[PDB]
Symmetry: C3
């Protein structure tokens, strides 16, 4: 049932190997695009597909955090000399064992002297004492990870096909992994060890996830899911305006990172009426419940170049970022006297549909859907709705399926492709200019979505 | 009046296209440098110039800020039990409507009990109450933007020239835009749709503006100008040591981001004499007036690789960074039996002038000015003032004008080209070594320029 | 005594130069790997070695810091109206000249009223006054530097060898420096100015040190050593959780950056017993002594791609980062009718040894040591301990020595090469598959090493 991939139209360069003071060897060179295949015969169809481009980021930091659910409760004393409510009992201290404590809860104390005698005698200088309690919100736990500069790997699929009877028969299928950060990587590619595959990257990948703090939900069983990015603290940092200040210890117990010491800086309270036991209370912090947390969607949902961004396995040592968009790699195929012949299939497209989108994260793109398409498809973006209007941008899209297929794809657009409807014309490689499919594509701009008082008694 | 560009000396690689099970096609391959042109005839002179290399960064955050002009005014009460000056009236509160308010001003209160009875009786425990007022300084408004990982575009200029009579005649002129982050981008380049242009980048651009917070002045009419970089807060951050804590709301009203809550942390005051109504007051913050703000020059002025860095248009969705310095792109020109012949013009230079500069931002460079020059010019930096001294560095500069022209350019230098005068010799491509112009170039090192108490009653 | 380097097996591409309207020139093109050499004869053996790949980062910020040794001493007054211990004497003030001061020490005051009358009468409201002293710990001084976006330089070694009698004789040896960030860099390479060397990078280097704050120890004589990275403040930042808040002025005197103003925010104290003069005291800060500092090892020790990362010289303007791992560069050698012939030497390996390591910083690698090896060595990593088990990864290693030599090297591994022992098979370029050396390599995973209360009277 196995069929070959679309054999891409590629220019080949004849390279001649250097000579040694013994016994010349010819090599075939070409650039291979990400998600494309190259086919050749040897004088059994051999196919090389660039399946994956990945960044393997070492995880240099790890801590477990949650979203705190905060409740503060205060008591006022009208008389500043009262034995009740003191810096001894409420300043730089956790709530006592005697103070009604839930197992999952963490409780820190605050002390506010120099209150106004509302509810007291004119000469009283009240003091307000508080318990600030933190609970894990909806038992939502997250793993915080520092991702550093990655190593780059390309995964190729080598498949060999024989055309026995009237159907294609898959004879060989192997996955070839090659490191991209250094020099040329070489290996044998066929079962007979006759054909060799050399891979060479020209510099860094066009994209990379920036060194920094990322995180994912931790679940029952398969702990980690897709990584996300939201302002988050490094292990040694304790900025209450960022995620991660509500940390989990060796046991599954959450605490406010340096809570006892920091509480007086974050919790701010003032009396309303001392007698009536009423007050104003706030938490000069971010990412807590109620009303101070909104979880960002994963990286792969919000960033078009990211196909996937996940922690590799349960050892939590590497984060693997799989690329949706990436530049070509340089390939060199070397091997009695034999002939290596490269083959490609024709490109087709029946029709297309789409919309020009400017998403809530400012990504300018053409959401393209092709119909009964395969191969290299050249697109041209026009100045207006008229098909004959000036070309403002040109691009090429590549369809993977050997048979004509219906597929969706994101084409990034330059800032010149501004507001309003315009024509986009698509033509398959080596088809008359008359054989182009033009359409008026509608424009959809989502407004920029971005983030950013006192509670009673 | 239109004349062609200098046709660059380029090596060409014969590539042969793969074959399909129908009906071989030859391609011409070469590397094109940024700001260079390549010329060819078809068997009407066709020219391809790599005009621009650009990064289109999506703008993921936006807020408007200004520079606050701060004035604090305090009143002291000798008696701690006085109805005047309390935590009710001055702690965690904006100044009242009754408290003399300018429309453009924002006013926050501070409360300082436990003062020393200087100006009172020995047993008094004074309290100091303050109004901390903020005004926009010189009505200077700025837009803060978060720039994320860009998409890359090359702009080429294709021009066709006929030599009718005794003058060059420009027959065709189009701008070709090509995306660099993915695979090979292809399009038709001539009016007759006979010639095709494939563009391929080998990885990321040698330069990129780092993901982060940038900003520009906002003006009357054409809102935004050149982008700048200075320590600046992300929308969800509120670090008083960085720009952006003085924000503008829906109306043109500026406020201290979380002012009511944060004032007691930033404003610090102490009595001098309670009776005399004198005090010490400071703002533990940065980027305010008087004496705490110094505006950084734009990115393109301070960073030699940046030609321009601007917000694209009034929709404020993309920032366009135009590159002054960038690596070459791989080009492949494909098409009865016709012959494609590449042509170049000779390189010349009459003389040169310059100085070796180490600017206030530590950029080590040769400020080069060429005279009656055109094309490829090879430079060599020497160990001493002697022309015959050891070569310590070699470089190539490219002059765009078809006719010999006078032009200025920045050549970056490695750390080996340290202090003191030295010889620099310049030779145009394919000129005798005798035909080199040597000069003793003077060295100019600017010291590193970098940034970083109590006011009375 | 000088011997040539191992001449690498390289494929050559015939390029033809464009033509001018005067009097064609053939060029030889190939990719050169970092730490490899290419040899050719001219119709005296000419060798080109890519010796170094370097980033020259401009230093945009500089300040000198140390590690503070903190001691706090407090005195309590039972009576809040006492002339002794006031906001005048202890709030927002350095310790007086009269207050026993060491020349190297810096002393800041804190004031804590509203204490509990432990050791006093029931109606007393004690006040606690402190001196917080800072000393340089072990006179350890560091230089903090901001490293910005670098310029890239390749250093080549051109050597010419004659084989006179029975020994190799080194006739010429020069170091060629070439900038990588822009277009093709060209120069003459032989003494006779007959051979030219053009160098072209395809994009940015596969690695780069991220723009940010770095630092090194400052010593007697040769001031700076290897750079390090640990959370560190920018010159305008003053985050007490990061390094650099303990700064050195024009003279060799250390101070707490904005100490007078910030002390009340960082130093937190509470009375134990007023009469007994006992208290609790802490410093809500990081990177101080005792017990709050642990120095990170240099970048080159912890990051496998970094060979060296140092400040260039005493002017402190550039940081040079030398790369251990980097992608290939494109080379083009151009020149009566003469013939250019490229030569390579055979590849050999007697045996190998190693271990698969996952270090304390999450780097996954094969610590490879080769025996009597030279040239291109192809490696294959297996699924299990069995030599015939499925290949999970393939790589190529390059040995520099012309003679068979014993050398250690780090091969990075993809996340697929998880826990447990497995076979690794090594084969030299153009040796039978039978001529491979397989070994069962043991796995060593170091746990992730990462960083992150009250003192008595
Ligand atoms: C795609 O390309 C291949 C190679 O050009 C096509 O041809 C098959 O393979 C060899 C030629 O290399 C022939 O001997 C076979 O007879 C071909 N198979 C068939 C089914 O004709 C292949 O057919 C192409 N596939 C499509 C879908 O067009
Ligand atoms: C630069 O290069 C072109 C091409 O080599 C020069 O030649 C012109 O173009 C064709 C050759 O391709 C000739 O038929 C024309 O007669 C040439 N024009 C002239 C003015 O002679 C062109 O002249 C060169 N320009 C300069 C300034 O040297
Ligand atoms: C490595 O390569 C060179 C070139 O192939 C070897 O050959 C020497 O150089 C020329 C050929 O270019 C001969 O005329 C010399 O006679 C060769 N020298 C010797 C010692 O035979 C060179 O020998 C090789 N080195 C090794 C260690 O194998
Ligand atoms: C593109 O449109 C298709 C429907 O035609 C939809 O499934 C897909 O999610 C859209 N993608 C984006 C990024 O809007
Ligand atoms: C280079 O010198 C010219 C004058 O010769 C001047 O216009 C230019 O601004 C200088 N550039 C720098 C970066 O110093
Ligand atoms: C690799 O092993 C050798 C000893 O065989 C040792 O000298 C070297 O430091 C090791 N390197 C690492 C990174 O473990």
């Amino acid at each position: 049932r196995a069929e070959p991939p679309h054999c891409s139209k590629t220019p080949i360069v004849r390279a001649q190997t250097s000579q040694n003071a013994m016994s010349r060897g010819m090599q075939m060179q070409f650039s291979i695009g990400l998600h494309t295949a190259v086919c050749f015969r040897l004088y059994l169809l051999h196919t090389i597909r660039l399946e994956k481009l990945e960044h393997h980021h070492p995880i240099t930091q790890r801590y477990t955090f949650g979203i705190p659910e905060v409740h503060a409760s205060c008591i006022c004393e009208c008389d500043a000399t009262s034995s009740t409510c003191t810096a001894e009992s409420h300043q730089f201290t956790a709530c006592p064992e005697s103070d009604k404590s839930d197992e999952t809860s963490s409780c820190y104390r605050t002390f506010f002297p120099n209150q106004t005698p509302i509810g007291c005698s004119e000469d009283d200088i009240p003091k307000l004492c508080c318990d600030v309690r933190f609970k894990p919100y909806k038992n939502m736990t997250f793993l915080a990870v520092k991702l550093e500069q990655p190593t780059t790997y390309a995964t190729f699929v080598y498949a060999a096909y024989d055309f026995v009877n009237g159907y294609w028969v898959e004879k060989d299928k192997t996955k070839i992994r090659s490191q991209l950060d250094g020099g040329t990587q070489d290996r044998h590619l066929d079962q007979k060890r006759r054909i060799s595959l050399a891979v060479t990257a020209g510099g860094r990948a066009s994209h990379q996830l920036e060194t920094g703090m990322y995180f994912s939900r931790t679940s029952n069983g398969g702990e980690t899911e897709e990584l996300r990015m939201q302002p988050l603290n490094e292990i040694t940092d304790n900025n209450f305006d960022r995620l991660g200040w509500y940390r989990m210890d060796d046991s599954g117990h959450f605490h406010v990172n340096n809570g006892v010491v920091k509480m007086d800086d974050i919790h701010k309270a003032k009396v309303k009426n001392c007698k009536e036991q009423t007050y104003k209370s706030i938490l000069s912090a971010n990412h807590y419940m109620p009303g101070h947390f909104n979880l960002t969607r994963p990286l792969e949902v919000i960033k078009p170049w990211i196909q996937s961004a996940r922690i590799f396995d349960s050892s939590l040592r590497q984060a693997v970022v799989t690329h949706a968009e990436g530049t070509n790699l340089q390939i060199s195929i070397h091997l009695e006297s034999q002939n290596l012949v490269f083959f490609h299939n024709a490109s087709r497209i029946r029709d297309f549909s789409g919309s020009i989108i400017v998403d809530s994260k400012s990504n300018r793109l053409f959401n393209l859907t092709v119909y009964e398409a395969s191969g290299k498809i050249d697109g041209s973006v026009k100045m207006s709705t008229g098909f004959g209007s000036d070309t403002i941008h040109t691009f090429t899209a590549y369809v993977s399926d050997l048979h004509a297929s219906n597929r969706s794809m994101i084409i990034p657009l330059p800032a010149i492709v501004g507001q309003g409807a315009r024509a986009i014309c698509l033509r398959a490689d080596s088809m008359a200019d008359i054989d182009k499919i033009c359409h008026v594509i509608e424009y959809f701009e989502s407004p920029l979505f971005e983030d950013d008082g006192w509670s009673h008694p």
